[PDB]
Amino acid sequence: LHTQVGRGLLGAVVNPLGEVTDKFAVTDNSEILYRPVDNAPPLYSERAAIEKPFLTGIKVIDSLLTCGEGQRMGIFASAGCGKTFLMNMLIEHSGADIYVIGLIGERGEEVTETVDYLKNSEKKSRCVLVYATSDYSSVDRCNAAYIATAIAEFFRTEGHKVALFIDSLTRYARALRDVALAAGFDSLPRLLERPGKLKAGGSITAFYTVLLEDPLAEEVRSILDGHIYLSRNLAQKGQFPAIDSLKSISRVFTQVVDEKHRIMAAAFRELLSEIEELRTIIDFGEYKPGENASQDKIYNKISVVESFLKQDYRLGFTYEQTMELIGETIR
């Protein structure tokens, strides 16, 4: 019903009962406070409009799927789609004050893998990790999401720019339906309307992961402010991150980017639309060089478009670098 919060949790690993189990970093701050994990969502008059961009340092996201402060974004992918490597990039190359990661998923090895990454991360002093393995009860794995959110809500009340990660929403939904069987559902919507930007405080930008083998994918997609879709076909071809921008959306995109950005994003998106039609024409074996000047122009733009989309997971790009690169690729 109550969990521990405060800056003293920075660098700590929290289990489904709210106790510090391990540490990936130590800070000089010792503050520990207690707040309930089932907090009422902010009123509509309590929330501020989503207007400032949450820069991620990932070229395809910042340019075509720009996130906003307080936005809730979905990450849709199958297993082995590099969903974990994408969240490592989001934590590494964004600029949030505090990162709150909630793992309600897998086995001890995947949790330890996240801690091992955090032990060598540049943001370890700003990170909190709440975990729930397969060995815990369904009630405990549900509570790991509420503990992670309540921890993020305290930092937001202090005025921090908080990034919340929940991996995964479906293994929360699995634990959710198991809990419902004991009683004989609706904690999903109230859980993911808790993030946002407060007029009187900071903001929580939340990234929720759902796994594709789906009905649950259809429910969450209309609740969130957008979704990022990791095609493992794109991963099979060697493009990382495997984000397919043509099937992804940020519903606050035009609210948080300016007119010049919007125009370049539209020109790039149609360039990619013409690119994938050429891939179909090529796969059909009906592309002959020199026979169509428009197709030849599109063909010679494949390499520069492919290199703008691809990004080494250890490199981050500023907004001006991203806009500079997408400027060159559309000319």
Curated annotation (Swiss-Prot):
One of its GO terms (cellular component) is type III protein secretion system complex. It is found in: Cytoplasm. It catalyses: ATP + H2O + cellular proteinSide 1 = ADP + phosphate + cellular proteinSide 2. Disruption phenotype: Mutant is defective for assembly of the needle and secretion of the translocon proteins IpaB/SctE and IpaC/SctB. Amount of the needle filament protein MxiH/SctF is greatly reduced. T3SS effector protein secretion is reduced in Shigella strains coexpressing wild-type and inactive Spa47/SctN. Its EC number is 7.4.2.8. Changing D167E: Lack of ATPase activity. Changing F85A: Decrease in ATPase activity. GO terms for molecular function: ATP binding; ATP hydrolysis activity; identical protein binding; protein-exporting ATPase activity; proton-transporting ATP synthase activity, rotational mechanism. ATP binds at G80, C81, G82, K83, T84, F85. Changing E193R: Reduces oligomerization. Lack of ATPase activity. Abolishes invasion and hemolysis phenotype. Low levels of secreted IpaC. GO terms for biological process: protein secretion by the type III secretion system. Oligomerization increases ATPase activity. Monomeric forms exhibit low-level ATPase activity by forming short-lived oligomers with active site contributions from at least two protomers. In contrast, oligomers exhibit enhanced ATP hydrolysis rates that likely result from multiple preformed active sites within the oligomeric complex. Oligomerization is important for both enzyme activation and T3SS function. Changing D214A: Lack of ATPase activity. Changing E193A: Reduces oligomerization. Lack of ATPase activity. Exhibits moderate invasion and hemolysis levels. Low levels of secreted IpaC. Keywords: ATP-binding, Cytoplasm, Nucleotide-binding, Plasmid, Protein transport, Translocase, Transport, Virulence. The N-terminal domain is required for oligomerization and ATPase activity. The six N-terminal residues are necessary for proper oligomer formation, though their absence does not entirely preclude oligomerization. The extreme N-terminus is also required for interaction with MxiN/SctL. The N-terminal domain, not ATPase activity, is responsible for localization of Spa47/SctN to the injectisome. The binding of ATP induces a conformational change of a highly conserved luminal loop, facilitating ATP hydrolysis. The core secretion machinery of the T3SS is composed of approximately 20 different proteins, including cytoplasmic components, a base, an export apparatus and a needle. This subunit is part of the cytosolic complex. Forms homohexamers. Interacts directly with MxiN/SctL (stator protein) and Spa13/SctO (stalk protein). Can form a soluble complex with Spa33/SctQ, MxiN/SctL and MxiK/SctK. Belongs to the ATPase alpha/beta chains family. T3SS ATPase subfamily. ATPase component of the type III secretion system (T3SS), also called injectisome, which is used to inject bacterial effector proteins into eukaryotic host cells. Acts as a molecular motor to provide the energy that is required for the export of proteins. Required for type III secretion apparatus (T3SA) formation, proper protein secretion, host cell invasion and virulence. May play a critical role in T3SS substrate recognition, disassembly of the effector/chaperone complex and unfolding of the effector in an ATP-dependent manner prior to secretion. This is Type 3 secretion system ATPase. It comes from Shigella flexneri.
